[PDB]
């Protein structure tokens, strides 16, 4: 079937070329860019002990969750720089944390092969573990809450999995990736999702159907970063090849490349603003090189982190950008 | 408002209770001295030597691809590299894994303890007559002067184990930038825990000397 699989790979890449037309860099070249942003470090969220391997914001955009390999999980109050609900973790090495949209439940997960969910608003006022979602044979790398009871989890066993807290088991398993899957993103209309793995591919998924519908094979290296465009009709991924590229769901190809020749470092966290024309990508040169997101113009450098920025996310209403990094502090950007 | 002031007072009180908790288990955590092993989920053996915590991490359940979860262990005290010491060609897989760990841009800051765990298993294979074909420069290798483990040990076993040691240490010296140092060993061996203690002592000593730029 190896001879057969090359034929539909050649047929799909011609369907990209049949809809190649004009690229996004040529069309958007006429209109005015936003120019230089000059984001500044509003608030430094100090208190994490080891490297901050993962973070997530909230729908309320006030509380953010951030996960560090010390064994902690602090729901940071980003408006006043306050720590609320510092979860002590069973696993010392946590690589994911999704702040639940509703806000009641908080995920974690990592090398323990368990995505453990913590309910913040317990009846006793002390945060405990609701259900430990064991079942993955690989490391938990990204998690995203569908709602208060549904949580798809990216994992290192080449399979993402949709779980249910009420039963503690997998609703469905997404067995399409061929390498250990790194980042995860849910659409704003929460009907479908796309996850990036350590492949050349970041293939799209369906929540209710449970399996891959379209595959976006655009990066050279390990896609550590993924985030939808704010409509949900597109998404940008980021990998270790020092290029982050955007892909459209209605299309099938790479849109246009956000790369610069000075960048010789990997990408770990991409995130999108309220408007689509801004892309916050987090890099391995200890900075977050933000782009214009439509013109390959580096809109700014979010320097100020001494170690590698491993998780940068933006607020749901577009207020701020908080880039957690490996130097054990998050920083709020505006 | 007064209700806004009431919520911020409770938020600050919960924050200072959390700060008290995080000072307490910062005092726990900095005394932990985590290590990483190679060669469910992640396994924990919190062993104490000389009233010093050492929080070992066997990570066997993660699969063969390890390029992204080995980046968990750049802030670790040490990467205890267990080598099967016998040569699929599992020993050269350990050399390539050590070369991948050594030259990794995050693991450049953290040190590796090498142990060669199946050293007692190595003695039957080399005395029977099997690494000469598996390594061409073993013929051209010579034994160093500081190479006496024990007088009853055969010089062929000593030459083989020191060739395997400096086969890792060719990666440790001949490299680019990176602030980290290798501690090879030769292992029933009840002295291994002590060897981990002395090597992590020298690791955190060297980390403080590099913090003073003494290295």
């Amino acid at each position: 079937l190896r001879q057969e699989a090359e034929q539909l790979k050649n047929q799909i890449r011609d369907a990209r070329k049949a809809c190649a037309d004009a690229t996004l860099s040529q069309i958007t070249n006429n209109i005015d860019p936003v120019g230089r942003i000059q984001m500044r470090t509003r608030r430094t969220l100090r208190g994490h002990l080891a490297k901050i391997y993962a973070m997530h914001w909230g729908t309320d955009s006030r509380l953010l969750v951030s996960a560090s390999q010390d064994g902690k999980l602090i729901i940071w109050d980003s408006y006043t720089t306050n720590k609320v609900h510092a979860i002590p973790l069973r696993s010392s090495w946590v690589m994911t944390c999704a702040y639940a949209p509703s806000g009641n439940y908080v995920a974690c997960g990592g090398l323990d092969n368990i995505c453990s969910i913590y309910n913040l608003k317990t009846r006793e006022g002390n945060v405990r573990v609701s259900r430990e979602l064991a079942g993955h044979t690989g490391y938990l790398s990204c998690c995203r809450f569908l709602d208060d009871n549904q949580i798809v989890t990216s994992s290192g066993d080449t399979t993402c999995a949709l779980w249910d807290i009420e039963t503690g088991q997998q609703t469905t398993t997404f067995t399409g990736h061929t390498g250990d899957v790194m980042s995860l993103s849910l659409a704003p209309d929460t009907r479908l999702f796309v996850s990036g793995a350590c492949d050349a591919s970041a293939k799209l998924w369906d929540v209710r159907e449970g399996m891959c519908r379209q595959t976006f094979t655009g990066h050279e290296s390990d896609i550590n970063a993924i985030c939808f465009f704010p409509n949900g009709n597109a998404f940008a991924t980021g990998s270790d090849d020092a290029t982050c590229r955007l892909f459209d769901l209605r299309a099938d190809q790479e849109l246009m490349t956000y790369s610069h020749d000075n960048i010789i470092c990997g990408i770990t966290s991409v995130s999108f603003s309220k408007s689509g024309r801004l892309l916050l990508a987090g890099y391995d040169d200890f900075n977050c090189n933000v782009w214009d997101a439509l013109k390959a113009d580096r809109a700014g450098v979010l320097a100020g982190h001494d170690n590698r920025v491993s998780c940068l996310g933006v607020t749901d209403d577009g207020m701020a950008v908080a880039t957690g990094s490996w130097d054990s502090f998050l920083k709020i950007w505006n | 408002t007064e209700d806004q002031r009431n919520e911020e007072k409770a938020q600050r009180e919960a924050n200072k209770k959390i700060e008290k908790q995080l000072q307490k288990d910062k005092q726990v955590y900095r005394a932990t001295h985590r290590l990483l092993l190679l060669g469910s989920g992640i396994f924990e053996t919190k062993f104490q030597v000389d009233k010093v915590n050492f929080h070992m991490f066997d990570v066997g359940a993660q699969r063969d691809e390890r390029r992204k979860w080995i980046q968990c262990f750049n802030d670790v005290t040490a990467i205890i590299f267990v080598v099967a010491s016998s040569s699929t060609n599992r020993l050269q897989a350990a050399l390539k894994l050590f070369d991948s760990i050594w030259n990794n841009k995050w693991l450049r800051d953290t040190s590796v303890i090498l142990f060669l765990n199946k050293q007692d298993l190595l003695a039957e294979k080399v005395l029977a007559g099997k690494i000469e074909d598996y390594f061409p420069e073993f013929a051209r290798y010579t034994t160093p002067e500081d190479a006496t483990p024990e007088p009853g040990e055969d010089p062929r076993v000593t030459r083989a184990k020191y060739f395997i040691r400096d086969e890792f240490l060719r990666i440790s010296t001949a490299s680019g930038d990176g602030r980290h140092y290798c501690y090879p060993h030769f292992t029933v061996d009840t002295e291994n825990i002590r060897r981990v203690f002395n090597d992590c002592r020298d690791i955190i000593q060297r980390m403080h000397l590099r913090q003073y730029e003494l290295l």
Partner: nanobody
């Protein structure tokens, strides 16, 4: 698409020269450290050789160190591997394992099972 179409192999007598090549398109060849990994049936994935960017650091496994040489072509975007004086022990399935991150001197998981930047492979049978 990063696809890795290897070429070469076949029924070749031991001691006879063979040119191993992989197509290796979809990624920038000048940035990536490049690899060769073999896998015998019932043995497992075994690393053979690596070449760095522009051939700076070239190391070999000890089975083939005195008898193999590896070359790469940055302009033609193609990795090569000469084989000379073959014993019949290395009848393995050779596979042009590519290192995952380009600008890093390290190279993980090219002997890992179901690796994404590893080709389908060409059967190299010697008898």
């Amino acid at each position: 698409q990063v696809q890795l179409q290897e070429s070469g192999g076949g029924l070749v007598q031991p001691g006879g020269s063979l040119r191993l090549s992989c197509a290796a398109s979809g990624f920038t060849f000048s940035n990536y450290k490049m690899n060769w990994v073999r896998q015998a049936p019932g043995k497992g994935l075994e690393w053979v050789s690596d070449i760095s960017q522009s051939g700076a650091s070239i190391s070999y496994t000890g089975s083939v160190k005195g008898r193999f040489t590896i070359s790469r072509d940055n302009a033609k975007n193609t990795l090569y591997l000469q084989m000379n004086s073959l014993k019949p022990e290395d009848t393995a399935v050779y596979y042009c394992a590519r290192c995952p991150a380009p600008f890093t001197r390290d190279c993980f998981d090219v002997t890992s099972t179901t690796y994404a930047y590893r080709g389908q492979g060409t059967q190299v049978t010697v008898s």
